[PDB]
């Protein structure tokens, strides 16, 4: 059947904003996963998982009688899709069970791992999500084999359809770099937001870059991809050596024996894939990656044998039975156990990417230190495993259960506890009036609050106005935040705050994070008043102010907006049209198309544009909250044309006189062009819509202000 | 960006079930269009529409100073996508304003018509939908030009995204038949459910079949397509001749002058398309279809000139200025007015498809009768225009406003008014006990009520249990309804009914339509009791029984299910896989994926399969309402394979012994295979889910029983 996407493959796709509807969710609209999880007997689930580890099923027999290595890989892949550039991917939504991830070649045979967990899932039901269970099972695997984990938090709610993620443009699984849709350009520069070297890989190619088995070159790819998954050199070494202390790879015969991935398999496979014609097709004959490596002499026990082997031998390039490049220890004895036959032993083996840990000079130093001090290795691996598996969970307030680590980690963007009484509704009114009396304008107040709250992204639940990090490096200096303007507003607000807090009794005080939000609320109320409408904008206190010392400046860099349609802002010239980037930002903010539309139209007439640009400011009463953007956009008395100087900027002229009325960007005009957006704009531009426009704007403003408020969840 | 659809183009698309979510809708979830419409000043809207007729805008000047013809085509095209096969298309959701229909070639320049209506739409706001306004505008155009319409009902709610409709598989706009994705095969057989001869056309090619200008062959295409839009020969002749009494076609220069359709145009076009480089690009120079024909000597007034010209001249094949085939009156004088220049006149002209009305022998007789008896022509056209434009609105109960015709028409599948007291809750309890005491089984009761209620489709709101048409021709003889078994059940129910009604006072009685549904409710209650659960199933009385003479048997044929996954039924072997047909059926029933899942799993264990097939009956306690379907489907102790005798039937065998445990179809197993459906099945197959399964089943059962109950809306 030919679809709109086929006919108009470059029109904008709004369906990404309408996922996660209550229609697709089988739980009641009242279901609260956190409440279900808080009643789970987590100890009982772990005891069941522990027993599973050594209870082999004949449809996928356990290597060495222990599934631990398989489940560690499963949990690591569940997490290992994460990209810091947009916060997409990660373990937090259990997306490994859906397309495309369930059928990525790097996820081959993890369908079996997930199926092994069905009986436990079935037992505990809605009290443990698949997303939590995946991670939990990796923890229990590690515990069962003698490794002390750093802790575990539940609270990843299950999702019910695939997330819309850009995974790259290649039309061929695992395509080598340099094709017509190459994700690389220049000197092996990986395109943002990607974090893997080939379509369908988690990070890197275990044979080496584009298959070339050079551990030094491979180390470059490791370092770049891991950095794009928020991991530094020490964390990267600890993760790879830690993981590869367990289990084995599977490459017992030629890859041409392996059939269709799960999404392409026949219905009778019941969601499983990669059925293999090679001998029994499983167990001793398994083929997964094609490589056939077992790293340590005790694959079912934590040890420091990975580094003893890496540094204790020299390595020879060889081929697996499927033809994949891999390395064997020169002159070694057969000291590694076989996974099924107690009478057979094998020489130590390694992947090209394992050897990177020795042959890259900066990794070598860390690997040596971990080899000489295995307790340092164990602690680094525990911390990194925690980080990896929790990186997209959001604020610590979302962490559930009895195993949450008490240590506050800098990577969590921590928010201090509030230890004083909060402002009440009368105090909020007094502060709104003091803010308005200071002479801060609607434009300044709205722009400042927008800048602080709009860093939130629902992908990894980082950002938001909680913390007041807008006053800190690096947010205070982002160009989108207008650093000089911002500084003058913050200075005025900080004086109001000091005066209010100094006049209190009882220990009551207001955070600057709260005041910034409240002040933006006053700005929206005043704008409504300027239009003749009396509204109260909701406000919930309880944010706290984080310090510079509790803020990782480098980690914060990925939250910088380089494109923010809501402020008509674009930091440079990009390959992706600006309207596409608007919808991308709307999705990260968790907005629907109607919400996006209302919010944009309002922000335009409130003076939220960076630099005071007049683009899209289609009103003669700026700083009044009206539906003028829509009424003027939709007026067929104006004709629009792109400018000579800039094809991305348009002039609206009176059709009859030729007089210049307005200018706008693609971001503005899309609302008059795209057939679904223009239908939304028509609702808000109708004669009966001014009260609705104000109400719906106040509601979406409040939603944005509260995106990070999981303390009130 | 490579997507799941790109990698796995034949996996099933469930997003079709999650359209129309409140996410995409800018109105509140409380908005009720009927209530808004009931307050509209319809008379005021019409007076604005009358004024618009002759208010020419320079950007698309009105032919003859009057936009009536353009708006008549606009309304006709809005209605003219309707297919009786699935009830999809039609004017009832205003989908002409969205992709792909807004950009179909046959809708060229109707973007101008719709934009001329924006100021009216803006003025009245939510109180008149675009869907209603399109049709109203065509009515006002006809009235303005002298033709009295039969009536008008409001109540078409606007929609906010494109409908998922199969419009054919061709990848080229307007591709001629016989290509790699031909919609024709055999002796000019058009594939179901399609109702147009080429991709992007409303019905037929105005030059003739595949462009060949043979009016007799064209007539065959006219008759087949119009039949597939619910129109017989008399209605077809009346519509074509009635429509082409007005206005003109547009073909002033070569088609190569015409630019991108709206969905491909630049953002500056602000939703419009087909910008033309030919001279002024508009008015006297307009190019729409490429034909250049004006049918009557008074194109802005109702007349009897269409048939005077059709019969009064002989016709010669010629070409338009764009090179399109059309016909000119041999030896005629220049009697037709020009649209713009009072000093020019033209010879009468006709399309190939116009001449079909004379050269097809059956149309000739109708056309002659209409020529000789123009009052008959007028009344037929008024009735047919009403039908065309309201065909998809559903029962009469949905018709709003002061212009609804009082005459009840056969095509509306009318339901008699209820004129007696309805049964109350005590009476319902008494009838359910009598039903259960009769000896009717859970299987019979459930299967019968399912058969009655599940004929509903939300596409055109035909079907459902209202009317008791299951006891009439042709429903009582459909294979899917198990005619013999059905007859036995109905005989028992009719006896119950007779006895209950004979015992009443005060004129109370129960319809058989109600009793069918109520008896199905009793069967569901009984099934829950068989499983140990105490469940009351909601029931709403008020259905009435329609007569045979109120049931057009040929019109009812298109509701016959040839595939109904919910009864594991397929009438033959089809090119579309059965699981695709299930989701299609779920969409017509208005079900979400979780609803579809729960419903199907319950029906299987209640004995709703046609022929008492064991396919998918994964329980040892049939006729008990349990979640056994899910628990057994998801059991990894069973391995499934297709049978030797039939690749569409699967055997599930114990993995350890090889013993046969179950059989299933593709419809059954998809719930175990599709990664989103299996995630749903997992929720209902969990240990905590038995009570939820029962409750969610009763809710969806009730939903289906009430799909046609617009009397209670
Ligand atoms: C450069 C990064 C990495 C590369 C290229 C890589 C590559 C691979 C490959 C190719 C396999 C074999 C799959 C098969 O045939 O079954 C595998 C296995 C494994 N990986 Fe990694 N890996 C990397 C990092 C990680 C990390 C960070 C972890 C966990 C912390 C991990 C844990 C494991 C485990 C436990 C297995 C064994 C699975 C089994 O016993 O079934 N790896 N790895
Ligand atoms: C065999 C069926 C039909 C064919 C092939 C057909 C074809 C066409 C074409 C090709 C045009 C010219 C488009 C343009 O260049 O502007 C047109 C115009 C029109 N048709 Fe039809 N038509 C059909 C049936 C109908 C019916 C059922 C109605 C209404 C009841 C209708 C009413 C109109 C009117 C009013 C116009 C004039 C538009 C104007 O003045 O701008 N037609 N038709
Ligand atoms: Na994420
Ligand atoms: Na329809
Ligand atoms: O891995
Ligand atoms: O038409």
From Swiss-Prot, chains A, B:
Cross-linked residues, Tryptophyl-tyrosyl-methioninium (Tyr-Met) (with W-91): 203-229
Binding site for heme b: 244
The record's account of how the chain is modified after translation: Formation of the three residue Trp-Tyr-Met cross-link is important for the catalase, but not the peroxidase activity of the enzyme.
A biological process term (GO) from this entry: cellular response to hydrogen peroxide
Pfam family, one: peroxidase
The keyword Heme is annotated on this UniProt entry: yes
EC code(s) of this entry: 1.11.1.21
EC class name: oxidoreductase
Annotated site residues (Transition state stabilizer) in this chain: 73
Catalytic center residues: 77
Record's catalysed reaction(s): H2O2 + AH2 = A + 2 H2O; 2 H2O2 = O2 + 2 H2O
CDD domains linked: catalase_peroxidase_1, catalase_peroxidase_2
Function: Bifunctional enzyme with both catalase and broad-spectrum peroxidase activity.
Complexes and interactors: Homodimer or homotetramer.
Protein name, per record: Catalase-peroxidase
Species assigned in the record: Burkholderia pseudomallei (strain 1710b)
High-level lineage: Bacteria, Pseudomonadati, Pseudomonadota, Betaproteobacteria, Burkholderiales
């Amino acid at each position: 059947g030919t679809s709109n996407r086929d006919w108009w493959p470059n029109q904008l796709d709004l369906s990404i904003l309408h996922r996660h509807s209550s229609l697709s969710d089988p739980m009641g609209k009242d279901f609260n996963y956190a409440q279900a999880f808080e009643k789970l007997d987590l100890a009982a689930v772990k005891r069941d998982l522990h027993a599973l580890m050594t209870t082999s099923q004949d449809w996928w027999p356990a290597d060495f009688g222990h599934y631990g290595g398989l489940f560690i890989r499963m949990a690591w892949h569940s997490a290992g899709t994460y990209r810091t550039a947009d916060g997409r991917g990660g373990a937090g939504e259990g997306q490994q069970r859906f397309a495309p991830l369930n059928s990525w070649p790097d996820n081959a045979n993890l369908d079996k791992a997930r199926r092994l967990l069905w009986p436990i899932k079935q037992k505990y039901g809605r009290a443990i999500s698949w997303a939590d269970l995946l991670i939990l099972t990796g923890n229990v695997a590690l515990e069962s084999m003698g490794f002390k984990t750093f802790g575990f938090a539940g609270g990843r709610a299950d999702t019910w359809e695939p997330e819309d993620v850009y995974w790259g443009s290649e039309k061929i699984w695992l395509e080598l770099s340099g094709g017509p849709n190459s994700r690389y350009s220049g000197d092996r520069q990986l395109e943002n937001p990607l974090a893997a070297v080939q379509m369908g890989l988690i990070y890197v190619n275990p044979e080496g870059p584009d298959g070339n088995p050079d551990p030094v070159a491979a180390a470059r790819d490791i370092r770049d991809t891991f950095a794009r998954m928020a991991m530094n050199d020490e964390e990267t070494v600890a993760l790879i050596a830690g993981g590869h202390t367990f289990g084995k790879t599977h490459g017992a015969g030629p890859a041409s024996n392996v059939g269709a991935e799960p999404e392409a398999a026949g219905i009778e496979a019941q969601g499983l894939g990669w059925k293999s014609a090679y001998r029994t097709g499983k167990g001793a004959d398994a083929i997964t990656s094609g490589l056939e490596v077992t790293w340590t002499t005790t694959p079912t026990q934590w040890s420091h044998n990975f580094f003893e082997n890496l540094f204790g031998y020299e390595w020879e390039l060889t081929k697996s039975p499927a033809g994949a490049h891999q390395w064997v220890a020169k002159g070694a004895d057969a000291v590694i156990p076989d996974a099924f036959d107690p009478s057979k032993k094998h020489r130590p083996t390694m992947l090209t990417t394992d050897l990177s840990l020795r042959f890259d000079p900066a990794y070598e130093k860390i690997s040596r230190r971990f080899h000489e001090n295995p307790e340092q290795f164990a602690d680094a691996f525990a911390r990194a495993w925690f980080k990896l598996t929790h990186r997209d969970m959001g604020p610590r307030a979302r962490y559930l259960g009895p195993e949450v680590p008490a240590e506050v980690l800098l990577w969590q963007d921590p928010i201090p506890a509030v230890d004083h009484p909060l402002i009440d509704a009368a105090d909020a009114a007094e502060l709104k009036a003091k803010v308005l009396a200071s002479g801060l304008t609607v434009s300044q107040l709205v722009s400042t609050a927008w800048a602080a709250a709009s860093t939130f992204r629902g992908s990894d639940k980082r950002g938001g106005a909680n913390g007041a990090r807008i006053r800190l490096a690096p947010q205070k200096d982002w160009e989108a935040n207008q650093p000089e303007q911002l500084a003058a507003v913050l200075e005025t607000l900080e004086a109001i705050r000091t005066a209010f807090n100094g006049a209190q009794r009882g220990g009551k005080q207001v955070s600057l994070a709260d005041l910034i939000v409240l002040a933006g609320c006053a700005g929206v109320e005043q704008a409504a008043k300027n239009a003749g409408h009396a509204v109260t904008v909701p406000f919930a206190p309880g944010r706290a102010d984080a310090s510079q010392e509790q803020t990782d400046v480098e980690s914060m860099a990925v939250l910088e907006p380089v494109a923010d349609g809501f402020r008509n802002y674009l930091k440079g010239k990009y390959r992706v049209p600006a309207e596409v980037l608007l919808v991308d930002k709307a999705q990260l903010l968790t907005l629907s198309a109607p919400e996006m539309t209302v919010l944009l139209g309002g922000l335009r007439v409130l003076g939220a544009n960076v630099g005071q640009s007049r683009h899209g400011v289609f009103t003669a009463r700026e700083q009044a909250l009206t539906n003028d953007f829509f009424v003027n956009l939709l007026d067929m008395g104006t004709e629009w044309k792109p400018t000579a100087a800039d094809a991305d900027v348009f002039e609206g002229r009176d059709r009859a006189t030729g007089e210049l009325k307005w200018t706008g960007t693609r971001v503005d005009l899309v609302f008059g062009s795209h057939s679904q957006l223009r239908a939304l704009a028509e609702v808000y531009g109708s004669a009966d819509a001014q009260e609705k426009f104000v109400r719906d704007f106040v509601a979406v403003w409040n939603k944005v202000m509260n995106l990070d408020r999981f303390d009130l969840a």
